[PDB]
Amino acid sequence: RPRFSFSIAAREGKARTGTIEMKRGVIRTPAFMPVGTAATVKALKPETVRATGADIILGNTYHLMLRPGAERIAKLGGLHSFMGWDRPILTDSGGFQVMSLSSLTKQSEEGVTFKSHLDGSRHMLSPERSIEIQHLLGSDIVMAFDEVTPYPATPSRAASSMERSMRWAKRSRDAFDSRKEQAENAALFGIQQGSVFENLRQQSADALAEIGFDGYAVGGLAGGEGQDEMFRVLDFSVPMLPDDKPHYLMGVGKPDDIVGAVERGIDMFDCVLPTRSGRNGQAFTWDGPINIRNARFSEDLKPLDSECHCAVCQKWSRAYIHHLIRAGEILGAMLMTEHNIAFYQQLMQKIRDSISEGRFSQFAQDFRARYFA
Amino acid sequence: RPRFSFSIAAREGKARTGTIEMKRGVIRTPAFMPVGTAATVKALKPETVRATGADIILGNTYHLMLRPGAERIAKLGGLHSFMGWDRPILTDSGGFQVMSLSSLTKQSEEGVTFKSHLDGSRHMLSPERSIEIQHLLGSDIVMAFDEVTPYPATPSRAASSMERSMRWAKRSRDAFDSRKEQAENAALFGIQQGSVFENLRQQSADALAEIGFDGYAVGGLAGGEGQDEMFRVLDFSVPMLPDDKPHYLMGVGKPDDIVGAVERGIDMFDCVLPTRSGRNGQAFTWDGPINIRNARFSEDLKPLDSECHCAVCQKWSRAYIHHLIRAGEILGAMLMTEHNIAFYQQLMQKIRDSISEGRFSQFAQDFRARYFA
Ligand SMILES: [Zn+2]
Ligand SMILES: [Zn+2]
């Protein structure tokens, strides 16, 4: 396999289905990436993550650099070896979480210094250091280090952040390219910014395409704007990106969001929703989500979802899982997470098959009628 | 397979190895039973419990009756169906936990009434109700309902409790026998009491043998007396029990305790140690236990134990598991528990093979030299 090759096998409207071939494996697109926070997809062995259909997982740079440490993971042989997942890993740049989880940020053109939300330790993150950490982890898909624009943002501030992000995207590119081993074996994605503003999204897309990346993420969304606005922004933003490279919508999302975003040209997704909500009691079904803690499930012998092919739905009842989650049992988190992640993979499979067969628009319509019945 | 058949295949001194055949499967003895509290062996799917080598698990009656409820489990098809373990299950009588976990106990000759440590609900437990609950769960090995003698106990109080326990053992026997379906498909074990006193242990054994049970537990030990005293009591107590039936030491225990107790004629064991300590950071090894949270393991690439055949030791390093447990990750509990339970099953296998080969005494000596090196 090559370092990176994205091939589009079928299209329907703006939707695409295909494959990304990398050294560690093939990624089927549109793709959902389960999120591994501190080097684990929560409550799942990697073999179980793979069994659900995942082709690639996401690792959080910010969390890994704080614990167990980027250098330490490198010494121990890299993230893949450390956690036991041998397929591709995408790492985020660590920037988003600095804003959302650290204390005392000091921000500047060089990068950001911050205090750990764990200990009192002070850490630094810049385009160069972010790229270095991702190398130390041995990431397959490296994200450029950007400055995240909170929602809502004024046009002036959105512009300033976007412009800084574009300067940092060049720095990221150069850092990545300067490290022979990373340049030869990993891929680099740039992140489009500009908040909800069309002209800024355009300037950002143009800047990113001028530098040149293996893939392009749409950043700054799912920040509180709501689905209507998100979709409106995707409408004009995705077409600005090079059509022949993957389009990654960071941090999205709910099943309905994924469907609409694929309709708009998105090829890759990640979210903590299926894992996080899993441990919380929310199970996804084709008829909409359920909260398994609800008393109405205490004696329901049906599986979580009536069609789901996952091992949880083959083996255990809603009643049992209701019991486990109410009791705060670890097996409850294990089973809910496996089911939710498998649901997401089944959704992605249905999306890929429908596009390949030229009936994705019908699938979207059928999916919505039932999910929101 | 028959309802119950215990066969002894080999002996060495007081040690025995053999099999208990029951309708739901064969139990190899000496046996270790992982403990399922609220209908789950904590952090493990039943298939994983089986994969470690477990032939039978233990379920806690007290916890099951409070949540999700004995009647409810019956309605849903019984404990096996509910939790997805189709092999034998031994249920305790629920008495021990009433003493240790409930509030406001009212005790009498009829039984005990108590308040849930969960809600404010008031529950009752008597020989008859304990046997009924175990039937509703669909237990394969039913324990007689006894009164537990705290350590230390005066001879007078030990005697009074033992005598009451023997009256309750007859009541348990009669209750079990009166329910055709339970009598025909399950087995009933009596519990010897009498604290540390030889004459009381003798009276108790004589009373139990007169009633007649499928197996005999040594109760009242591991209550704070220490290994020396426990062993001293086992020395005279086990021989009092019918030699041709299984001998069950309830609530034991550490690996060294298991070895010494088998040397003294014990065939069955349960303890929360490998599960509980697992989540706590303690991993069993042939060279003694380790606490994986210790900083010395942060970059140790070796498996938890150098000889262990479990899936955890095949796949992950001490360094990774150290990280998971420090981080409070669910996968940390999953991996530690699987390893610890598999260690216990490997110990039991080595014990069975050594007895079968007439070299158990040497195995005990070799085990101790290394474990306590
Ligand atoms: Zn499922
Ligand atoms: Zn092991």
Author numbering:
A (entry chain A), B (entry chain A): 11 to 383
Quote the authors verbatim.
Transfer RNA–guanine transglycosylase (Tgt, EC 2.4.2.29) catalyses the exchange of a specific guanine base in tRNA molecules by a substituted 7-deazaguanine. Bacterial Tgt functions as a homodimer in which the protomer consists of a (βα)8 barrel harbouring a Zn2+ binding subdomain close to the C-terminus. The reaction follows a ping-pong mechanism including a covalent Tgt⋅tRNA intermediate.
In both maps fragmentary density is visible for the dihydroxy-cyclopentenyl substituent (7H as well as 8F, 8H). Figures 7F and 7H show that the mutation of Val233 to glycine results in a considerable gain of space in the substrate binding pocket which allows the dihydroxy-cyclopentenyl of queuine to occupy the cavity located between Gly233 and the side chain of Cys/Val158. Within this cavity the dihydroxy-cyclopentenyl apparently has no specific interaction with the protein. As a consequence, it seems to be highly flexible which is reflected by the ill-defined electron density assigned to this moiety in both structures. As in the structure of queuine-bound Tgt(Cys158Val), nearly no electron density can be attributed to the side chain of Val158 in the Tgt(Cys158Val/Val233Gly)·queuine complex structure, indicating an increased mobility of this residue upon the binding of queuine. Solely in the case of Tgt(Cys158Val/Val233Gly), the variant that should best approach the eucaryotic enzyme, the result of the trapping experiment indicates that the covalent enzyme·tRNA complex may, though to a low extent, be able to bind queuine.
